[PDB]
Amino acid sequence: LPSGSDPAFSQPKSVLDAGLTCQGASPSSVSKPILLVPGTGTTGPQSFDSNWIPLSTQLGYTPCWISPPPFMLNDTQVNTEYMVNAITALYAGSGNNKLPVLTWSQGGLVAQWGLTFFPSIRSKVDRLMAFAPDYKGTVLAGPLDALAVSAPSVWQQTTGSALTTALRNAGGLTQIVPTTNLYSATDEIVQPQVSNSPLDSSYLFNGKNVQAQAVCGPLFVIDHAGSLTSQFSYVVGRSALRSTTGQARSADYGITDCNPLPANDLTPEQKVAAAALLAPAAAAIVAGPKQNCEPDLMPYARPFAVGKRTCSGIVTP
Ligand SMILES: CCCCCCCCCCCCCCCCCC(=O)OCCOCCOCCOCCOCCOC
Ligand SMILES: *[C@@H]1O[C@H](CO)[C@@H](O[C@@H]2O[C@H](CO)[C@@H](O)[C@H](O)[C@H]2NC(C)=O)[C@H](O)[C@H]1NC(C)=O
Numbered sequence: 001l002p003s004g005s006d007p008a009f010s011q012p013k014s015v016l017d018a019g020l021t022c023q024g025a026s027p028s029s030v031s032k033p034i035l036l037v038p039g040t041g042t043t044g045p046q047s048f049d050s051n052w053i054p055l056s057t058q059l060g061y062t063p064c065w066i067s068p069p070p071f072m073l074n075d076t077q078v079n080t081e082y083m084v085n086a087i088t089a090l091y092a093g094s095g096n097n098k099l100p101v102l103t104w105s106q107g108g109l110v111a112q113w114g115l116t117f118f119p120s121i122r123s124k125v126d127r128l129m130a131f132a133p134d135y136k137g138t139v140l141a142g143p144l145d146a147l148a149v150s151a152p153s154v155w156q157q158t159t160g161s162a163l164t165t166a167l168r169n170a171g172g173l174t175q176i177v178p179t180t181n182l183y184s185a186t187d188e189i190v191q192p193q194v195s196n197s198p199l200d201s202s203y204l205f206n207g208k209n210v211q212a213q214a215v216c217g218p219l220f221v222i223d224h225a226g227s228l229t230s231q232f233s234y235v236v237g238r239s240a241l242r243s244t245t246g247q248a249r250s251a252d253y254g255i256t257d258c259n260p261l262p263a264n265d266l267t268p269e270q271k272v273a274a275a276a277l278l279a280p281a282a283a284a285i286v287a288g289p290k291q292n293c294e295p296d297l298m299p300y301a302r303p304f305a306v307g308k309r310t311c312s313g314i315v316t317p
Helices: 013-018 046-047 052-058 078-095 106-117 137-145 154-158 162-170 212-214 231-242 268-275 278-287
Strands: 018-020 035-036 062-065 099-104 124-132 180-183 208-212
Touching: 013 018, 013 078, 018 078, 035 046, 035 052, 035 078, 035 106, 046 052, 052 062, 052 231, 062 078, 078 099, 078 106, 078 154, 099 106, 099 180, 099 231, 106 124, 106 162, 124 231, 137 154, 154 162, 180 231, 208 212, 212 231
Parallel strands: 035 062, 035 099, 099 124, 124 180, 180 208
Antiparallel strands: 018 062
């Protein structure tokens, strides 16, 4: 695992601060905060206001979130800057107290990239609850890369990319802080997720890796969005955030919790919204930026991906 000082921010602090927002609070005077990191093609509110913003409020947290522009479609290394800055702020603002991080899809990759390359936040992050994280990218993005219709983060979230290679070689496929990874074998966006083994994109060594079908059986189907919004997902998330081990406890969930529909504590209005979670995301992707190469790795990550090819050529130290 990398050590030493944190790499410098490529973006101005003022820009990173504008991306951070808390519900009913300022990061400089927030109480019991929880940082939420959105998925690709969405903003914090787009990913969570129909699910984890109201759910985490009910658990006694002040939900905060980052909205890296544009809709998490730009360089993942930059999106990570919004998070690193957010954690530094919230930690100090809550009176120097560790806080939990809750992510969805790419947000999980962003969280792990930050923990791996920015040492200073490892002691500030209490635990990590990731839903459908793609630490190893996805094979499904492959075709889009070929047709040159992929946004910067889509290339990076491609299996075998320079980014996911750098994460692996840096030691990021093993938890850094207590981590729970809830995911589904029936994920239409992120694959492979079928083996319920280290072969899965969402698997982290030493982590509490929870594949939905391992607990609920093969006929339990929850897609990329259901992994975040479902009643079962809620029961595992609540377990993870309350747990004294920092990870969800098997004793806290089971077969009786195998409900694929949006969490019960959501209003009828929120459930409908949670059900159409993918619509805005797909729209943003379809209309967003496109390129025929993967964005270059920043200096700090280059030694870990020697030989891979990015927009400027073959990576070298
Ligand atoms: C309704 C789309 C279902 C299509 C199933 C085939 C898979 C193709 C989509 C792979 C895109 C890879 C995105 C990066 C992986 C991580 C995504 C993430 O962080 O979570 C966010 C949710 O992502 C929503 C993606 O769904 C939209 C994909 O559909 C866009 C297809 O349009 C292609 C047109 O060219 C832009
Ligand atoms: C999107 O990501 C790109 C790639 O990292 C960012 O571009 C860099 O931005 C810094 C600060 O302006 C410059 O010093 C670098 O020269 C840029 N590099 C490249 C390759 O463009 C960009 O700032 C991010 N975009 C948004 C909208 O946040």
